[PDB]
Short mmCIF file of C-alpha atoms and ligand atoms in Angstrom, two decimals:
data_model
loop_
_atom_site.label_atom_id
_atom_site.label_comp_id
_atom_site.label_asym_id
_atom_site.label_seq_id
_atom_site.Cartn_x
_atom_site.Cartn_y
_atom_site.Cartn_z
CA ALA A 1 -111.97 10.78 -33.87
CA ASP A 2 -110.51 11.45 -36.94
CA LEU A 3 -109.41 15.86 -36.85
CA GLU A 4 -112.98 15.89 -38.10
CA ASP A 5 -114.84 15.06 -35.39
CA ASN A 6 -112.07 16.45 -33.33
CA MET A 7 -112.61 19.19 -34.68
CA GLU A 8 -116.66 19.16 -34.27
CA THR A 9 -115.69 19.39 -30.56
CA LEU A 10 -113.64 21.41 -30.29
CA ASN A 11 -117.18 23.66 -32.21
CA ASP A 12 -119.66 22.25 -30.53
CA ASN A 13 -118.30 22.88 -27.16
CA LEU A 14 -117.53 26.59 -26.75
CA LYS A 15 -121.12 26.87 -27.49
CA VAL A 16 -122.61 25.21 -25.40
CA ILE A 17 -119.96 27.20 -22.73
CA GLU A 18 -122.20 30.40 -24.40
CA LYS A 19 -124.78 29.32 -23.75
CA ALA A 20 -124.02 27.83 -19.89
CA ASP A 21 -125.84 28.82 -17.15
CA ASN A 22 -123.42 27.57 -14.56
CA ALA A 23 -120.03 26.14 -13.71
CA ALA A 24 -120.49 22.61 -13.74
CA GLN A 25 -121.90 23.01 -17.00
CA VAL A 26 -118.90 25.51 -18.39
CA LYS A 27 -115.49 22.77 -16.84
CA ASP A 28 -117.32 20.22 -18.45
CA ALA A 29 -117.84 21.44 -22.09
CA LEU A 30 -114.01 22.76 -21.43
CA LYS A 31 -113.38 18.99 -19.66
CA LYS A 32 -113.88 18.07 -23.83
CA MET A 33 -112.47 20.68 -25.91
CA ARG A 34 -108.82 19.18 -24.33
CA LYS A 35 -109.62 16.23 -24.67
CA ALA A 36 -110.43 16.93 -28.60
CA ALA A 37 -107.12 18.63 -29.09
CA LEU A 38 -105.30 16.33 -27.89
CA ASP A 39 -107.01 13.74 -29.86
CA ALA A 40 -106.44 15.56 -33.12
CA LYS A 41 -103.60 15.74 -32.26
CA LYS A 42 -102.40 12.39 -33.29
CA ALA A 43 -104.05 13.92 -36.54
CA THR A 44 -101.82 14.43 -40.38
CA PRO A 45 -103.93 17.42 -41.83
CA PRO A 46 -104.75 16.85 -45.19
CA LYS A 47 -102.39 20.07 -46.13
CA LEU A 48 -99.88 18.92 -44.28
CA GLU A 49 -100.14 15.00 -46.19
CA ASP A 50 -97.08 15.42 -47.96
CA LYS A 51 -94.53 16.43 -45.77
CA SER A 52 -91.98 15.34 -44.11
CA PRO A 53 -94.11 13.59 -39.95
CA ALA A 54 -91.80 16.28 -37.71
CA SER A 55 -91.02 18.20 -40.51
CA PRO A 56 -91.45 22.02 -38.73
CA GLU A 57 -95.11 22.49 -39.86
CA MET A 58 -96.06 19.19 -37.96
CA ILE A 59 -94.43 19.87 -35.34
CA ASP A 60 -95.79 23.77 -35.64
CA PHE A 61 -99.29 22.04 -35.63
CA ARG A 62 -98.77 19.77 -33.25
CA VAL A 63 -97.16 21.88 -30.03
CA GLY A 64 -100.31 24.77 -32.12
CA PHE A 65 -102.42 21.95 -29.56
CA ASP A 66 -100.52 21.91 -26.63
CA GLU A 67 -101.51 25.99 -25.88
CA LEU A 68 -105.26 25.44 -27.92
CA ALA A 69 -105.44 22.38 -24.01
CA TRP A 70 -103.19 25.62 -21.85
CA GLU A 71 -104.82 27.50 -22.67
CA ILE A 72 -108.37 25.41 -22.23
CA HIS A 73 -106.84 25.58 -18.46
CA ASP A 74 -106.88 28.75 -18.23
CA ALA A 75 -110.59 28.98 -18.94
CA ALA A 76 -110.22 25.64 -16.58
CA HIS A 77 -108.76 27.35 -13.52
CA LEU A 78 -111.38 30.86 -13.80
CA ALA A 79 -114.37 27.86 -13.73
CA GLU A 80 -113.47 25.86 -11.38
CA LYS A 81 -112.81 29.46 -9.36
CA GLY A 82 -116.62 30.07 -9.66
CA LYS A 83 -115.39 33.07 -12.03
CA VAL A 84 -118.53 31.97 -15.16
CA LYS A 85 -118.69 34.84 -17.32
CA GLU A 86 -114.57 35.04 -17.22
CA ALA A 87 -114.39 31.54 -18.18
CA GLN A 88 -116.92 31.98 -21.24
CA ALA A 89 -115.29 35.29 -21.92
CA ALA A 90 -111.97 32.69 -21.82
CA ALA A 91 -113.58 30.46 -24.23
CA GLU A 92 -114.41 32.83 -26.78
CA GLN A 93 -111.14 34.51 -26.88
CA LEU A 94 -110.28 30.77 -27.07
CA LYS A 95 -110.70 31.64 -31.13
CA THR A 96 -108.17 33.50 -32.35
CA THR A 97 -105.84 30.16 -31.39
CA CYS A 98 -108.58 28.17 -33.50
CA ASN A 99 -107.48 30.90 -36.53
CA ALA A 100 -104.26 31.43 -36.11
CA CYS A 101 -103.98 27.97 -37.41
CA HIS A 102 -106.22 28.23 -39.30
CA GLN A 103 -104.84 30.30 -41.45
CA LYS A 104 -102.06 28.51 -41.94
CA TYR A 105 -102.85 24.71 -42.32
CA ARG A 106 -106.95 25.29 -43.00
CA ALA B 1 -84.96 6.76 -16.63
CA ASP B 2 -86.02 4.44 -19.01
CA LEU B 3 -90.05 3.36 -19.90
CA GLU B 4 -89.67 0.59 -17.85
CA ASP B 5 -88.58 2.28 -14.71
CA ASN B 6 -91.51 4.88 -15.53
CA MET B 7 -93.56 2.73 -15.98
CA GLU B 8 -92.90 0.45 -12.67
CA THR B 9 -93.22 4.66 -10.93
CA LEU B 10 -96.02 4.94 -12.56
CA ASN B 11 -97.81 1.53 -11.41
CA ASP B 12 -95.88 1.91 -7.54
CA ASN B 13 -97.55 5.88 -7.40
CA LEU B 14 -100.98 4.34 -8.36
CA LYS B 15 -100.67 2.07 -5.34
CA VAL B 16 -99.48 4.34 -2.99
CA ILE B 17 -102.76 7.16 -4.17
CA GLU B 18 -104.61 3.65 -2.86
CA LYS B 19 -103.49 3.53 0.71
CA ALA B 20 -102.88 7.38 1.44
CA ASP B 21 -104.12 8.34 4.37
CA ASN B 22 -103.99 13.07 3.37
CA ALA B 23 -103.37 15.01 0.43
CA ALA B 24 -99.92 15.71 1.20
CA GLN B 25 -99.41 12.01 0.21
CA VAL B 26 -102.17 11.85 -2.43
CA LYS B 27 -100.41 14.57 -4.01
CA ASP B 28 -97.75 13.66 -3.91
CA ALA B 29 -97.45 11.06 -5.93
CA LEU B 30 -99.94 12.26 -8.48
CA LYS B 31 -96.63 13.92 -9.59
CA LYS B 32 -94.06 11.64 -9.04
CA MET B 33 -96.20 10.12 -11.56
CA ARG B 34 -96.25 13.15 -14.29
CA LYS B 35 -92.96 13.07 -14.34
CA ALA B 36 -92.52 9.57 -15.08
CA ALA B 37 -95.47 9.57 -17.99
CA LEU B 38 -93.41 12.47 -19.18
CA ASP B 39 -89.78 10.60 -19.63
CA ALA B 40 -91.60 7.88 -20.33
CA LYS B 41 -92.46 10.04 -23.66
CA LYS B 42 -89.16 10.73 -24.70
CA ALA B 43 -88.87 6.51 -25.13
CA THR B 44 -89.72 4.42 -27.87
CA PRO B 45 -91.93 0.62 -27.23
CA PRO B 46 -89.71 -2.11 -28.33
CA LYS B 47 -93.04 -2.59 -30.26
CA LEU B 48 -92.45 0.48 -32.17
CA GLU B 49 -88.76 -0.11 -32.67
CA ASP B 50 -88.93 -1.02 -36.51
CA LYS B 51 -91.09 2.44 -37.33
CA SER B 52 -90.00 5.84 -38.51
CA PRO B 53 -89.51 8.02 -35.87
CA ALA B 54 -93.15 10.39 -36.67
CA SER B 55 -94.60 7.31 -37.82
CA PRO B 56 -99.06 7.80 -37.28
CA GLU B 57 -97.39 5.30 -33.85
CA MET B 58 -95.49 6.93 -32.34
CA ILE B 59 -97.61 9.83 -32.18
CA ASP B 60 -100.30 8.49 -30.92
CA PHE B 61 -97.41 6.72 -28.53
CA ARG B 62 -96.51 9.86 -27.67
CA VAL B 63 -99.71 12.06 -27.09
CA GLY B 64 -100.84 9.15 -25.24
CA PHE B 65 -98.59 9.84 -21.99
CA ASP B 66 -99.74 14.08 -22.90
CA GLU B 67 -103.44 12.83 -21.99
CA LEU B 68 -102.29 11.03 -18.87
CA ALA B 69 -100.43 13.85 -17.80
CA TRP B 70 -103.69 16.50 -18.29
CA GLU B 71 -105.85 12.99 -16.29
CA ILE B 72 -103.83 13.44 -13.50
CA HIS B 73 -103.02 16.79 -13.15
CA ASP B 74 -107.48 16.79 -12.80
CA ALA B 75 -106.57 14.43 -10.02
CA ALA B 76 -104.64 16.53 -8.66
CA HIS B 77 -106.58 19.70 -8.59
CA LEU B 78 -109.50 17.64 -6.70
CA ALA B 79 -106.60 16.50 -4.07
CA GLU B 80 -105.62 20.66 -4.25
CA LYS B 81 -108.98 21.68 -3.18
CA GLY B 82 -108.95 18.44 0.05
CA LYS B 83 -110.78 16.60 -1.98
CA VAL B 84 -109.29 12.72 -1.58
CA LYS B 85 -111.34 10.29 -1.77
CA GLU B 86 -112.95 12.31 -4.52
CA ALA B 87 -108.63 11.93 -5.85
CA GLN B 88 -108.88 8.40 -5.45
CA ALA B 89 -111.36 7.70 -7.46
CA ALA B 90 -109.58 9.31 -10.17
CA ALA B 91 -106.60 7.35 -9.75
CA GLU B 92 -108.07 4.45 -9.62
CA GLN B 93 -109.44 5.71 -13.31
CA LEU B 94 -106.23 6.76 -14.67
CA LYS B 95 -106.31 2.85 -14.84
CA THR B 96 -108.33 3.32 -18.98
CA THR B 97 -105.64 5.36 -19.94
CA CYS B 98 -103.22 2.74 -19.06
CA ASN B 99 -104.98 0.64 -20.11
CA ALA B 100 -105.99 1.61 -23.67
CA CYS B 101 -102.44 2.37 -24.30
CA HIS B 102 -100.68 -1.05 -23.82
CA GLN B 103 -103.55 -2.98 -25.52
CA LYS B 104 -101.20 -1.18 -28.63
CA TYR B 105 -98.54 -0.72 -28.59
CA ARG B 106 -96.85 -3.07 -25.42
CA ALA C 1 -90.24 33.98 -31.49
CA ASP C 2 -87.41 32.14 -33.04
CA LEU C 3 -85.72 29.93 -30.30
CA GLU C 4 -83.02 32.92 -28.85
CA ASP C 5 -85.45 35.05 -28.62
CA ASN C 6 -88.06 33.05 -26.60
CA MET C 7 -85.66 31.93 -23.98
CA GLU C 8 -84.51 35.73 -23.52
CA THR C 9 -88.27 36.20 -22.49
CA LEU C 10 -87.81 33.33 -20.16
CA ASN C 11 -84.62 34.28 -18.96
CA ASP C 12 -86.62 37.80 -18.40
CA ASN C 13 -89.30 36.42 -16.63
CA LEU C 14 -87.44 34.67 -14.37
CA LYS C 15 -86.20 38.28 -13.06
CA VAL C 16 -89.35 39.63 -12.82
CA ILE C 17 -90.84 36.77 -10.68
CA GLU C 18 -87.66 37.68 -8.74
CA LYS C 19 -88.53 41.31 -7.34
CA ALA C 20 -92.36 41.28 -8.12
CA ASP C 21 -94.70 42.59 -5.83
CA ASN C 22 -97.85 40.19 -5.82
CA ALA C 23 -99.31 37.54 -7.11
CA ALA C 24 -100.64 39.04 -9.99
CA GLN C 25 -96.73 39.86 -10.65
CA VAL C 26 -96.14 36.39 -10.69
CA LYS C 27 -99.21 35.18 -12.50
CA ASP C 28 -98.44 37.63 -15.30
CA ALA C 29 -94.64 36.46 -15.32
CA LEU C 30 -95.70 32.75 -15.41
CA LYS C 31 -97.73 33.05 -18.90
CA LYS C 32 -95.31 34.57 -20.58
CA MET C 33 -93.17 31.52 -18.83
CA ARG C 34 -95.41 29.01 -20.56
CA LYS C 35 -96.28 30.37 -23.85
CA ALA C 36 -92.43 31.36 -24.57
CA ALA C 37 -91.49 28.07 -23.70
CA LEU C 38 -94.54 25.96 -26.16
CA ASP C 39 -92.96 27.78 -28.62
CA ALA C 40 -89.47 27.19 -27.97
CA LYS C 41 -90.29 23.16 -28.58
CA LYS C 42 -91.28 23.86 -32.10
CA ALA C 43 -87.36 25.01 -32.52
CA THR C 44 -84.35 23.30 -34.23
CA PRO C 45 -81.94 24.26 -31.83
CA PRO C 46 -78.36 25.17 -33.64
CA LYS C 47 -76.62 21.68 -32.28
CA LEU C 48 -79.17 19.77 -33.30
CA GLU C 49 -79.58 20.89 -36.95
CA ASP C 50 -78.06 17.58 -38.73
CA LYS C 51 -79.68 14.97 -36.35
CA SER C 52 -83.25 13.93 -38.17
CA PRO C 53 -86.66 15.36 -37.24
CA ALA C 54 -87.64 13.34 -34.81
CA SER C 55 -84.82 11.62 -34.10
CA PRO C 56 -84.56 10.82 -30.06
CA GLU C 57 -82.71 13.90 -29.29
CA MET C 58 -85.41 16.01 -30.90
CA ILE C 59 -87.46 14.40 -29.23
CA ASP C 60 -85.48 14.81 -26.01
CA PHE C 61 -85.08 18.99 -26.80
CA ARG C 62 -88.50 18.74 -26.97
CA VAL C 63 -90.25 17.09 -23.74
CA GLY C 64 -87.85 19.56 -22.42
CA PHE C 65 -90.44 22.16 -22.89
CA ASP C 66 -93.26 20.68 -21.53
CA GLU C 67 -91.78 18.96 -18.52
CA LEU C 68 -90.56 22.95 -18.50
CA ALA C 69 -94.22 23.98 -19.41
CA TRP C 70 -95.66 22.12 -16.32
CA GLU C 71 -94.07 23.56 -13.79
CA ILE C 72 -94.47 26.79 -14.75
CA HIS C 73 -97.97 25.51 -14.32
CA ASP C 74 -96.58 24.36 -10.62
CA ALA C 75 -95.53 27.95 -9.28
CA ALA C 76 -98.67 29.66 -10.89
CA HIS C 77 -101.03 26.83 -8.48
CA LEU C 78 -98.73 28.87 -5.25
CA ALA C 79 -99.29 31.93 -7.32
CA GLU C 80 -103.33 31.21 -7.56
CA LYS C 81 -103.69 29.77 -3.52
CA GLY C 82 -101.87 33.34 -2.70
CA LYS C 83 -98.75 31.20 -0.83
CA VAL C 84 -96.00 34.14 -3.56
CA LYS C 85 -93.27 33.21 -1.48
CA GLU C 86 -93.61 29.92 -1.92
CA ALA C 87 -94.58 30.74 -5.32
CA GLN C 88 -91.21 33.51 -5.83
CA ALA C 89 -88.82 30.05 -4.37
CA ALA C 90 -90.13 27.17 -7.06
CA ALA C 91 -89.86 29.64 -9.80
CA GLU C 92 -86.18 29.59 -8.58
CA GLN C 93 -85.74 26.22 -8.91
CA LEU C 94 -86.98 26.29 -11.90
CA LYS C 95 -82.92 26.60 -12.82
CA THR C 96 -83.15 22.65 -12.75
CA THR C 97 -84.58 22.47 -15.15
CA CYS C 98 -83.33 25.70 -17.97
CA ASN C 99 -79.68 24.50 -16.60
CA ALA C 100 -80.38 20.17 -17.51
CA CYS C 101 -81.09 20.74 -20.46
CA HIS C 102 -78.67 23.69 -21.81
CA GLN C 103 -75.82 21.01 -20.41
CA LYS C 104 -77.32 18.71 -23.41
CA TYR C 105 -78.58 21.08 -26.60
CA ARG C 106 -77.46 24.78 -25.76
C1 HEC D 201 -98.83 4.18 -23.53
C2 HEC D 201 -98.94 5.24 -24.12
C3 HEC D 201 -98.90 3.95 -22.57
C4 HEC D 201 -99.15 4.41 -22.11
C5 HEC D 201 -100.39 5.92 -21.36
C6 HEC D 201 -98.82 3.78 -20.28
N1 HEC D 201 -98.46 2.49 -19.80
FE1 HEC D 201 -97.37 0.63 -19.12
N2 HEC D 201 -96.94 0.55 -20.72
C7 HEC D 201 -97.02 0.89 -22.19
C8 HEC D 201 -95.47 0.11 -22.47
C9 HEC D 201 -95.11 0.57 -24.35
C10 HEC D 201 -95.02 -0.12 -22.01
C11 HEC D 201 -94.58 -1.44 -22.12
C12 HEC D 201 -91.84 -1.15 -21.68
C13 HEC D 201 -91.50 -2.13 -21.87
O1 HEC D 201 -90.88 -1.98 -22.27
O2 HEC D 201 -91.78 -3.63 -21.80
C14 HEC D 201 -95.60 -0.16 -20.56
C15 HEC D 201 -95.58 -1.42 -19.56
C16 HEC D 201 -95.61 -0.76 -18.43
C17 HEC D 201 -95.98 -2.00 -17.20
C18 HEC D 201 -95.06 -2.85 -17.08
C19 HEC D 201 -93.20 -2.81 -17.27
C20 HEC D 201 -92.33 -3.67 -16.21
O3 HEC D 201 -92.75 -4.61 -14.48
O4 HEC D 201 -91.54 -4.68 -17.60
C21 HEC D 201 -96.01 -2.16 -15.66
C22 HEC D 201 -96.66 -2.19 -14.69
C23 HEC D 201 -96.77 -0.98 -16.29
N3 HEC D 201 -96.55 0.12 -18.02
C24 HEC D 201 -98.30 0.27 -16.00
C25 HEC D 201 -98.76 1.53 -16.61
C26 HEC D 201 -99.55 2.78 -15.22
C27 HEC D 201 -100.18 1.78 -14.43
C28 HEC D 201 -100.06 3.52 -16.60
C29 HEC D 201 -100.76 4.00 -15.71
C30 HEC D 201 -100.99 5.14 -14.93
C31 HEC D 201 -99.33 3.17 -17.23
N4 HEC D 201 -98.68 2.12 -17.70
C32 HEC D 201 -99.08 4.02 -19.15
C33 HEC D 201 -97.08 1.70 -22.49
C34 HEC D 201 -97.90 2.98 -21.60
C1 HEC D 202 -84.50 22.44 -23.83
C2 HEC D 202 -85.58 21.56 -23.21
C3 HEC D 202 -84.57 23.70 -22.41
C4 HEC D 202 -85.27 24.79 -21.97
C5 HEC D 202 -86.09 23.53 -21.02
C6 HEC D 202 -84.15 25.86 -22.08
N1 HEC D 202 -83.14 25.87 -22.56
FE1 HEC D 202 -82.43 28.07 -22.58
N2 HEC D 202 -81.73 27.48 -24.56
C7 HEC D 202 -81.72 25.84 -25.10
C8 HEC D 202 -81.10 26.97 -26.58
C9 HEC D 202 -81.34 24.80 -27.36
C10 HEC D 202 -80.70 27.06 -26.37
C11 HEC D 202 -79.59 27.71 -27.51
C12 HEC D 202 -80.57 28.73 -28.43
C13 HEC D 202 -79.21 28.96 -29.54
O1 HEC D 202 -80.21 30.05 -30.26
O2 HEC D 202 -77.83 28.93 -29.42
C14 HEC D 202 -81.42 27.73 -25.04
C15 HEC D 202 -80.01 29.36 -24.82
C16 HEC D 202 -80.53 29.70 -24.07
C17 HEC D 202 -80.81 31.56 -23.49
C18 HEC D 202 -79.36 32.55 -24.48
C19 HEC D 202 -80.31 32.92 -25.54
C20 HEC D 202 -79.28 34.29 -25.75
O3 HEC D 202 -79.21 35.07 -25.11
O4 HEC D 202 -79.25 33.98 -27.31
C21 HEC D 202 -80.76 31.51 -22.89
C22 HEC D 202 -80.30 33.40 -21.03
C23 HEC D 202 -81.99 30.23 -21.61
N3 HEC D 202 -81.82 30.02 -22.69
C24 HEC D 202 -81.72 30.97 -20.12
C25 HEC D 202 -83.76 29.46 -20.13
C26 HEC D 202 -84.75 28.78 -18.97
C27 HEC D 202 -84.00 31.17 -17.73
C28 HEC D 202 -85.36 28.28 -19.39
C29 HEC D 202 -85.28 27.79 -17.93
C30 HEC D 202 -86.89 29.17 -17.32
C31 HEC D 202 -84.64 27.50 -20.15
N4 HEC D 202 -83.28 28.39 -21.13
C32 HEC D 202 -84.69 26.25 -20.45
C33 HEC D 202 -82.74 24.89 -24.39
C34 HEC D 202 -83.90 24.98 -23.67
C1 HEC D 203 -103.87 23.59 -35.11
C2 HEC D 203 -103.18 23.90 -34.49
C3 HEC D 203 -105.62 24.09 -35.09
C4 HEC D 203 -106.53 24.15 -33.59
C5 HEC D 203 -105.44 25.17 -32.71
C6 HEC D 203 -107.50 24.28 -34.06
N1 HEC D 203 -108.39 23.48 -35.32
FE1 HEC D 203 -109.99 23.64 -36.21
N2 HEC D 203 -109.04 22.65 -37.83
C7 HEC D 203 -107.66 22.20 -38.52
C8 HEC D 203 -107.68 21.92 -39.49
C9 HEC D 203 -106.21 21.98 -40.25
C10 HEC D 203 -108.59 22.27 -40.32
C11 HEC D 203 -109.09 21.34 -41.33
C12 HEC D 203 -109.42 19.55 -41.28
C13 HEC D 203 -109.65 18.66 -41.99
O1 HEC D 203 -109.78 17.60 -41.76
O2 HEC D 203 -110.03 19.43 -43.34
C14 HEC D 203 -109.59 22.25 -38.54
C15 HEC D 203 -111.43 22.25 -39.48
C16 HEC D 203 -112.26 22.54 -38.51
C17 HEC D 203 -113.95 22.97 -38.67
C18 HEC D 203 -114.61 22.42 -39.41
C19 HEC D 203 -114.48 21.22 -39.30
C20 HEC D 203 -115.14 20.23 -40.44
O3 HEC D 203 -116.81 20.78 -39.99
O4 HEC D 203 -115.22 19.67 -41.28
C21 HEC D 203 -114.09 23.85 -37.30
C22 HEC D 203 -115.38 23.86 -36.93
C23 HEC D 203 -113.16 23.62 -36.78
N3 HEC D 203 -112.16 23.14 -37.18
C24 HEC D 203 -112.83 24.28 -35.20
C25 HEC D 203 -112.35 24.94 -34.54
C26 HEC D 203 -112.06 25.54 -33.48
C27 HEC D 203 -113.73 25.98 -32.67
C28 HEC D 203 -110.04 24.96 -32.94
C29 HEC D 203 -110.13 25.88 -30.68
C30 HEC D 203 -111.36 26.85 -30.22
C31 HEC D 203 -110.32 25.03 -33.97
N4 HEC D 203 -110.54 24.14 -34.99
C32 HEC D 203 -108.61 24.99 -33.99
C33 HEC D 203 -106.42 22.66 -36.77
C34 HEC D 203 -106.41 23.37 -36.27
CA1 CA D 204 -108.36 9.04 -32.58
CA1 CA D 205 -115.96 17.75 -43.87
CA1 CA D 206 -128.52 29.11 -20.87
CA1 CA D 207 -85.37 8.89 -19.86
CA1 CA D 208 -103.69 3.82 4.61
CA1 CA D 209 -107.24 25.31 -7.71
CA1 CA D 210 -92.88 30.95 -32.67
CA1 CA D 211 -78.78 36.70 -27.37
CA1 CA D 212 -76.99 35.47 -30.49
CL1 CL D 213 -108.88 21.23 -18.28
CL1 CL D 214 -93.13 14.42 -32.99
CL1 CL D 215 -95.50 16.55 -28.55
CL1 CL D 216 -100.22 17.15 -11.98
CL1 CL D 217 -99.43 28.54 -16.59
MN1 MN D 218 -103.97 23.62 -12.82
#
């Protein structure tokens, strides 16, 4: 999928997690975020189309999705230990990672 | 190890997992797959030797191993909860990720 | 942070883990290592400054941090099951991955 669709998947599943009522809903949404995050990592964002494909900005951009994916996995660890409300709080904390990339490249 | 060796390791351990009799055999084989997947990520496949090293195809290629490593990890989570049959089924499902890359770059 | 700050973080938290007294201290230190590992992945090490940004050495370098992050996570799994001493042993074993990269690019 393209970058925008992957971002909407990220945003949609954050709101699913917030409203989720059991561990299985959280874990399924988190899996969809991780998939979207890895798929977004294949893209060139519009503000970096003029840079080299392995410029430090494109590397930083791509590693940003590794960091997002690992943080998502931390939340997944909380959810499958049954710590649903802790997992939902960790999901909401992902926004600091969303924001950090946006302020640089969005 | 070179790309072909890593691919044989991936294929060999898929069959070890299929025939495994306990969680420890599944976990050990999945670990060897993840290692092989990350090692394969360092290579240039023959069909992409003419593209630039960070072309969209080489990025798609490299991220394909991230996707495979995470999917392997999902199976390891099943095997660590002692859900051996589920872990074996998830390992069989990895083939859709194997295939998807092959049809583009093999 | 820059590359050498991330390396000091990696080295400091290895010593924290060696001296840790409970799972929480191991888990917290491992997570600082993973973060530092992914951040170091964004850098160009002095010995590769003259190489192409996606040369096979820079790819090998960056994948070295994926391998390090996954090995850290393996130790994190041990510590999350309360196997504190096994987690500490695995953290010591990380040094073979530290060394392997240093001998090539440090
Ligand atoms: C891309 C992201 C890939 C993923 C994921 C997997 N494979 Fe693969 N494979 C890929 C390429 C580009 C090649 C060509 C290698 C060459 O130099 O010819 C291959 C090759 C194989 C082979 C045959 C290797 C040989 O005998 O010479 C096998 C058996 C194989 N791949 C298996 C395999 C499996 C089981 C995977 C998932 C678990 C898998 N591959 C992932 C690219 C990619
Ligand atoms: C590559 C894939 C590496 C891995 C994995 C690890 N390190 Fe590293 N390290 C690497 C380089 C290229 C450098 C040179 C940095 C420079 O700017 O000169 C380093 C450096 C260090 C240092 C010294 C840093 C300093 O004090 O200036 C230390 C203490 C260090 N590295 C430790 C370390 C540990 C403990 C690792 C594993 C847990 C590790 N490194 C991994 C490249 C790579
Ligand atoms: C970089 C490493 C990013 C991370 C991590 C996240 N996002 Fe992002 N996002 C990024 C870019 C470069 C763009 C611009 C895309 C474009 O083509 O214009 C975006 C965009 C979005 C959007 C808007 C998409 C749209 O509706 O057109 C949303 C809603 C969005 N991003 C949300 C989002 C969330 C919730 C993230 C993590 C929790 C996140 N993004 C991570 C770059 C990066
Ligand atoms: Ca896509
Ligand atoms: Ca839009
Ligand atoms: Ca609800
Ligand atoms: Ca190799
Ligand atoms: Ca058997
Ligand atoms: Ca677990
Ligand atoms: Ca940094
Ligand atoms: Ca120093
Ligand atoms: Ca110094
Ligand atoms: Cl996850
Ligand atoms: Cl790259
Ligand atoms: Cl990468
Ligand atoms: Cl794994
Ligand atoms: Cl971890
Ligand atoms: Mn895990």
